[PDB]
């Protein structure tokens, strides 16, 4: 009776998913984080707590696939609680979530935020988990025995400072009593929600299957949040990158700047080769296109529809290995731009004809529909052609 | 146009999946391994090569989620090749598969078959992969630099012998030229097969999603291979375990003995609490029940329909933590047995009425159909009520 929807970004991040996830929570009773750690979040800066915590009817789940720093989580809980939110009644946390602890962060540093080494412990069948907080004897004996190895690696191998065991025990003294009312078998709860016919939103940041204990055939719709152009933060291959004045104008209109560093992001044309792979890997049902108004006023637009490698071969998907992008170039289609503003448009027919043709061409190339268009920051500044939960 | 089917076991292994996977390859053009390593395989003992290698029309894929020892793989390839099979034309291997190498096996030993430490390297973004064999400079510089750490851990931490770098390079000298005609972008090939409308079988041993680069909504049917009773090999909690003469008779009739050790497996009643969780986690579409004839002639049968913990609480799913099985007991339903042989029966109406009622009760309890019944070892010794690819 209910519908189970996955929402994820389709490019390299910064697709503008925050406003869209918030909009979708209007139709969900349940919101689930199932992967990742504390990496990026909607605006307080919430990195671990799922998005629907503001809506009073929504239950929020941190499922077993999330690795979490408990002090990071309690700090978010207290920050929300200070703003009055009854967080503890509506937040639920898997007993199976592996913990991110100071030795994980230290390992990351010596190699160069703790997320990787936490997943490493899990794969090695040695990770401390939320459930271990409730067996304080086991928590201390595993923590001590884990530190014997990690501190050895940290000091005898990387010549970096150790993580003190006693101080970690002192820091963890309150964690069990603080988390206790919220811990549970999250997969069981999700399947009970599914049985009751409630709408469940899986908020992408490990798949839904393993990360939430939720079989693939129960997923009804995968929404891919997709920016009308492409951005990158890190270095490395970016075939549609613009190093010119159009790229600079996209950066300014899109406010494409690091929220912490202030460094401009790399900007470029829409890349349908990248999107083809994202669609296949995630069986994406439809797209939500964001920031279309950034392109308002450009004379021409380009869309990369293929890649041509160094040998001149035509590629329909990005190559697997990063070194294979060396001497690789995009194959572009050209579409005419528009001059009228598309900002805050609320009905498709109000868009200029060339904006609608741009959106139609993306649909034709990718073979899936654009079911949502975001034209500005407000919630009602969205066109929904087909609702993910309908 | 095609159908994409996942086949997996629903209990603790030894569900008898080999004959069933072989039967399903009659209807598949493509068979994919997407997880695990070389742990168990159908009867030559094939541990890495997917099951449909005997059928001439079938292409077999080892997708990126498989970790593989190359010498183990080449040994299977040569063993098949000696029996005449044109393996290299029909076997395809992901460039992204992480390698299992001697240092992984050594790490496993010092902790106490290399599969775990291989996945550990992958999570730490340091794993050697099949694709690295084709950049011999990189392969050697990564291998040397990986060994500096692993041998340090092996000798300075576990006081165990090191893995010699030079001898590993010598052993790997042929691997690239031997594997070269078979390596590819496996996810891309699978999506091209899906586009051509070909039936794809995913052979369960990481999910299909990440392990094969294949989105969840493309999965059309999940077949759960399920023994008519439960078995366990290892120690630990087994709520329906029989320690009596019925358990011993099940062990003998089912030939439930370790293929290598000869040790009898632990045997017990069918456990629908275990199956409920397997169904939810894997969104299982229907079951293939195996070894029903093992129960021929028993006076009564039992099915565990709930658990009761130490406090007397009734559980519908197995608890998450292993320590929570302490002082836990199954809640049984009792059904009458049958005396007539069900071995090699080919039409449901030929089964005794009590055998059909047993199967009907399992369906009622679990809420999904029994779509296939295996009544013996031959291929035509199967009743197919609904074909996974139909």
Curated annotation (Swiss-Prot), chains A, B:
A Pfam family assignment: Adenylsucc_synt
Main location: cytoplasm
UniProt-listed InterPro entries: Adenylosuccin_syn_GTP-bd, Adenylosuccin_syn_Lys_AS, Adenylosuccinate_synth_dom1, Adenylosuccinate_synth_dom2, Adenylosuccinate_synth_dom3, Adenylosuccinate_synthetase, P-loop_NTPase
Compartment list: Cytoplasm
EC number assigned by the record: 6.3.4.4
Residues annotated as catalytic: 14, 42
SMART domains, alphabetized: Adenylsucc_synt
Keyword Zinc: no
KW Cell membrane (keyword) present: no
Domain of life: Bacteria
Residues that, per the record, bind substrate: 259-265
Residues annotated for IMP binding in this entry: 14-17, 39-42, 125, 263
Entry cofactors: Mg(2+)
Keyword terms, alphabetized: Cytoplasm, GTP-binding, Ligase, Magnesium, Metal-binding, Nucleotide-binding, Purine biosynthesis
Cofactor notes: Binds 1 Mg(2+) ion per subunit.
CDD domains per record: AdSS
Binding locations of Mg(2+): 14, 41
Residues that bind GTP: 13-19, 41-43, 265, 291-293, 374-376
Function according to Swiss-Prot or TrEMBL: Plays an important role in the de novo pathway of purine nucleotide biosynthesis. Catalyzes the first committed step in the biosynthesis of AMP from IMP.
Record-stated family: Belongs to the adenylosuccinate synthetase family.
Protein name: Adenylosuccinate synthetase
Gene: purA
